């Protein structure tokens, strides 16, 4: 049912965001020792980021951006605008400051309930902007309006920001 699918995804997304923050906290001192102009330290950083990515259920892509430097596991160059921006961190490395953004493209739960149960997912802010959608009926960026299409839905508040996860079904 929808209610049992909305609370599991909220709790899973709640847990994943915690693991990201914990990762950051525990890698603070290590990052300050890593010079990202040195290829050994770049490899060490990629190893830690890819380790974190695959410890999470969801499909996540990282973008580590610095001065004239771009490090990512988005090897197919998927458009991040169609993903959910899920954490942002300003990190001090040995050589410069880098911005780390983590995007959510899908989760094994949301992709399964969409295939098996035809239950789709939306993520909207308190301003009602669409921040994620696995349904083409809806367009990222535009506003959410439940009535127009009016499906049986159930929403919860996401833990890390003023966002709401909405799972619906026709």
């Amino acid at each position: 049912t929808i209610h049992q699918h909305v609370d599991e995804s909220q709790s899973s997304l709640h847990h994943t965001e915690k693991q990201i923050q914990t990762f950051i906290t525990q890698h603070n001192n290590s990052f300050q020792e890593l010079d990202l102009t040195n290829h050994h330290d770049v490899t060490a950083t990629k190893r830690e980021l890819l380790k974190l990515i695959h410890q999470q259920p969801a499909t996540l892509y990282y973008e580590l951006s610095g001065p004239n430097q771009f490090i990512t596991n988005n090897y197919e160059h998927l458009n991040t605008k169609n993903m959910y921006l899920f954490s942002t961190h300003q990190l001090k490395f040995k050589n410069s400051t880098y911005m780390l953004k983590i995007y959510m493209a899908n989760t094994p739960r949301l992709s399964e309930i969409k295939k098996d149960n035809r239950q789709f997912a939306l993520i909207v802010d308190q301003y009602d902007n669409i921040l994620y959608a696995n349904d083409d009926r809806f367009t990222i960026g535009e506003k959410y309006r439940p009535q127009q299409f009016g499906f049986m839905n159930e929403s919860v508040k996401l833990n890390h920001a003023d966002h709401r996860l909405i799972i619906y079904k026709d």
Binding site: G66, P67, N68, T72, K81, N95, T97
Partner: protein, 294 residues
């Protein structure tokens, strides 16, 4: 009261940073977008009562044709900025440094040498390179200044314009070079890396004859009721932590001394880029330099 910002930067590049200022200062920031010259022109034709508060971004020290539209302001923390790029201009605060570049298609280049502007004049590249309209884009304007700075000859500009295709938009230059329509093009580092980062075969060249460095600025707009948070926004955008994020996201260089790069080896250090000598940089008003090359 809503704080209104004019900005030639794309919305998605500055909105997250302005959102943090919104939370820090409990204010809402509305953004007006467009090219630098169009924003300036529409601002000049706005009454005193409907004008915004801050102009954020663009080569303001080189493009502002109406200084009476802006308020003189110099924060006391200007001593934290690089001396060579501190604004010599009462109504502009220097903000970010952006190198202009030649972008080269690495699939097409082969053995053709492209180190600067004079390599672009090779017969094998005639009609196969592109630039943006200097009358409507600051990128094309800055590149024509760099070409003019080579020998202080207007004829050098005209010879280049008889060799390279002129496009209406700066963004079309990098797009068409990256997609293989042109061998090379005149762009800027941030635009080049944007397409390089999504897999396109583009190389970045600092013109060896002299590399024009864009000094983007921030200016307070003269209006009837200035928003009291606007000076805090200028200080926020020029702060040390915000400049560190901007350098990482914009592929720019910081205006601050404590953020700038000084490690001798690295290319991100300004001293490793062949910049135009200060004595040669054209000190001509924006409207007059355009008149010279028309």
């Amino acid at each position: 009261n809503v704080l209104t910002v004019y900005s030639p930067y794309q919305s998605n590049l500055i909105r997250p940073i302005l959102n943090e200022f919104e939370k820090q200062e409990h204010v809402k920031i509305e953004i007006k977008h467009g090219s630098t010259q169009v924003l300036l022109s529409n601002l000049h034709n706005e009454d005193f009562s409907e004008r915004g508060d801050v102009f954020m971004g663009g080569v303001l020290s080189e493009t502002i044709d109406h200084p009476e539209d802006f308020v003189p302001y110099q924060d006391t923390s200007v001593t934290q900025q690089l001396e060579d790029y501190r604004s010599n201009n009462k109504y502009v605060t220097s903000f970010l440094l952006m190198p202009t570049v030649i972008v080269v298609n690495s699939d097409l280049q082969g053995d053709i040498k492209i180190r600067g502007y004079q390599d672009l004049l090779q017969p094998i590249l005639k009609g196969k390179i592109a630039y943006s309209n200097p009358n409507t884009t600051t990128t094309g304007y800055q590149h024509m200044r760099a070409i003019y700075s080579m020998h202080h000859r207007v004829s050098d500009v005209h010879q280049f314009q008889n060799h390279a295709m002129q496009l209406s938009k700066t963004s079309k230059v990098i797009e068409d070079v990256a997609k293989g329509k042109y061998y090379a093009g005149l762009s800027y580092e941030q635009d080049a890396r944007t397409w390089k980062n999504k897999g396109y075969p583009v190389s970045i060249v600092y013109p060896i004859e002299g590399t024009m460095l864009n000094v983007d600025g921030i200016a307070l707009v003269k209006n009837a009721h200035p928003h009291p948070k606007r000076k805090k926004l200028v200080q926020y955008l020029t702060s040390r932590s915000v400049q560190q994020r901007l350098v990482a996201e914009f592929d720019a260089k910081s205006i601050r001394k404590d953020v700038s790069e000084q490690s001798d080896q690295s290319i991100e250090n300004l001293k490793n880029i062949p910049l135009i000598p200060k004595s040669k940089l054209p000190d001509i008003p924006h409207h007059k330099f355009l008149e010279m090359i028309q």
